[PDB]
């Protein structure tokens, strides 16, 4: 009935939760491995960049496989990797485990984007919604109380319990040429990097760079959650029209918040509002892209979305890596400004292609 989709929604919740979660566990993991909080962002780069390389191949090579059998194996790789993430003894192994999840993710996102056949985005994006506001926060909380490995194991078990309802299912190019969208692919990579230079380390920035608490951090990851929620629902209303404007402004705003990271770093209420805008910004620039890809590739959407998935993660890992370099070579404070550079260019490029198309 509904329940064959509802279970899938929870699956949507849980796979995003693990993706986000290590953004507010970097310090718990740092303590454990004896490496600076910035040094562990490789595990974000590797995750994304591995899910970048394989995203097309994997969903492609598995196109033959019936959906129930598919999701099963998929979820087995996930659950096992998490056990290994919990067991992990070297940061090498931790990242080996992350790669294990990467593969699971790679496959997954395109299967459900196919299995999504605004009644799918409704039940799925509620999963992804809840994956932000509960997932990462509680994820952060459990890491504080029970240690990160335990957090990972938790997910691991969660994936198992969701699976037995998934075991109650029945058995089931020219795009490069098209330069309307390859433009949109470009804007995506550029803009994402902007966000993920700063955001990826919003914890070590909050604690180490700014006068603030570990609980203030955990407060902020919630605040970017709801801002994400607000953002999503702002995009709900005026989404079919003005969307080009709404992305361009959202990038504009994103420019703003990045540049104003240290101007806000001393006001704990400023971060509070920075995050409310920042969060709304991203969600718009996120949802403006998806929507504009679906538009610019009705033919072979899965492939469009599969490709789109991969380039976003390129941008994540790139973001994460520059964020790592700034902190490791220069200083973690300036990730704000360094972020705002791609943010500007994207805001330029956005308006260029939007006013072009
Ligand atoms: C793994 C995901 C696939 C990447 C496609 C991203 C779209 C951006 C355009 O790609 C172009 O392709 C050239 C090939 O040589 C590169 O020189 C150059 O960087 C780039 O302008
Ligand atoms: C200048 C007018 C035309 C704008 C065209 C889009 C601008 C793209 C900027 O390039 C980016 O520069 C970063 C430098 O660190 C790289 O990390 C990143 O991967 C790369 O893609």
UniProtKB/Swiss-Prot annotation:
- Membrane topology per the record? Multi-pass membrane protein
SUPFAM superfamilies attached to this UniProt entry: MFS general substrate transporter
Q: Which Pfam families match?
A: MFS_1 (PF07690)
Q: Which CDD domains match?
A: MFS_NepI_like
Places the protein is found: Cell inner membrane
Name where it mostly resides: membrane
Membrane-spanning residues: 5-25, 40-60, 71-91, 93-113, 118-138, 152-172, 179-199, 216-236, 245-265, 269-289, 303-323, 334-354
Q: Which UniProt keywords apply?
A: Cell inner membrane, Cell membrane, Membrane, Sugar transport, Transmembrane, Transmembrane helix, Transport
Per its record, what are the GO molecular function terms?
carbohydrate transmembrane transporter activity; transmembrane transporter activity
Q: Give ranges for the Periplasmic compartment.
A: 26-39, 92, 139-151, 200-215, 266-268, 324-333
Q: Which residues lie on this side of the membrane: Cytoplasmic?
A: 61-70, 237-244, 290-302
What PROSITE patterns does the record tag this protein with?
A: MFS
* Gene Ontology annotations of biological process type: transmembrane transport
Q: Name one GO cellular component term.
A: plasma membrane
Give the protein's biological function.
Involved in the efflux of sugars. The physiological role may be the reduction of the intracellular concentration of toxic sugars or sugar metabolites. Transports L-arabinose and to a lesser extent IPTG. Seems to contribute to the control of the arabinose regulon.
NCBIfam families referenced in this protein's UniProt entry, alphabetically: PRK03545.1 (NF002921)
Q: What is this protein called?
A: Sugar efflux transporter
Q: Which organism is it from?
A: Escherichia coli (strain K12)
What gene name is given for the protein in this entry?
sotB
């Amino acid at each position: 009935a509904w329940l064959r989709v509802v279970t899938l929604a929870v699956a949507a919740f849980i796979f995003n939760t693990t993706e986000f979660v290590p953004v507010g566990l970097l310090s718990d993991i740092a303590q454990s491995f004896h490496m600076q909080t910035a040094q562990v962002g490789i595990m974000l780069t590797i995750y994304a960049w591995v899910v970048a390389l394989m995203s097309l191949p994997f969903m492609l090579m598995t196109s033959q496989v019936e959906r129930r059998k598919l999701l099963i194996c998929l979820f087995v790789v996930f659950i096992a990797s998490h056990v290994l993430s919990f067991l992990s003894w070297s940061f090498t192994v931790l990242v080996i485990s992350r790669i294990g999840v990467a593969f699971a993710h790679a496959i997954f996102w395109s299967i459900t984007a196919s299995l999504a056949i605004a009644q799918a985005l409704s039940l799925i994006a509620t999963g992804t919604a809840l994956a932000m506001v509960l997932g990462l926060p509680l994820g952060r909380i459990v890491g504080q109380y029970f240690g990160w490995r335990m957090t990972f194991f938790a997910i691991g078990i969660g994936a198992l319990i969701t699976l037995l309802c998934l075991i109650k299912l029945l058995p089931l190019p020219l795009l490069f040429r098209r330069p309307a969208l390859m433009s949109i692919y470009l804007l995506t990579v550029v803009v994402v990097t902007a966000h993920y230079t700063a955001y990826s380390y919003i914890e070590p920035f909050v604690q180490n760079i700014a006068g603030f608490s570990a609980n203030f951090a955990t407060a902020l990851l919630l605040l970017l959650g709801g801002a994400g929620i607000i953002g999503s629902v702002i995009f709900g209303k005026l989404g079919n029209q003005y969307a080009s404007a709404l992305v361009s402004t959202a990038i504009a705003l994103l420019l703003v918040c990045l540049a104003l990271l240290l101007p806000a770093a001393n006001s704990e209420i400023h971060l509070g509002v920075l995050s409310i805008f920042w969060g709304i910004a991203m969600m718009i620039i996120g949802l403006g892209m998806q929507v504009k890809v679906l538009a610019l590739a009705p033919d072979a959407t899965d492939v469009a979305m599969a490709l789109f998935s991969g380039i976003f993660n390129i941008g994540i890992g790139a973001g994460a890596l520059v964020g790592n370099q700034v902190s490791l070579h220069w200083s973690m404070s300036m990730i704000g400004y360094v972020g705002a550079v791609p943010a500007f260019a994207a805001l330029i490029w956005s308006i260029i292609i939007f006013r072009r198309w």
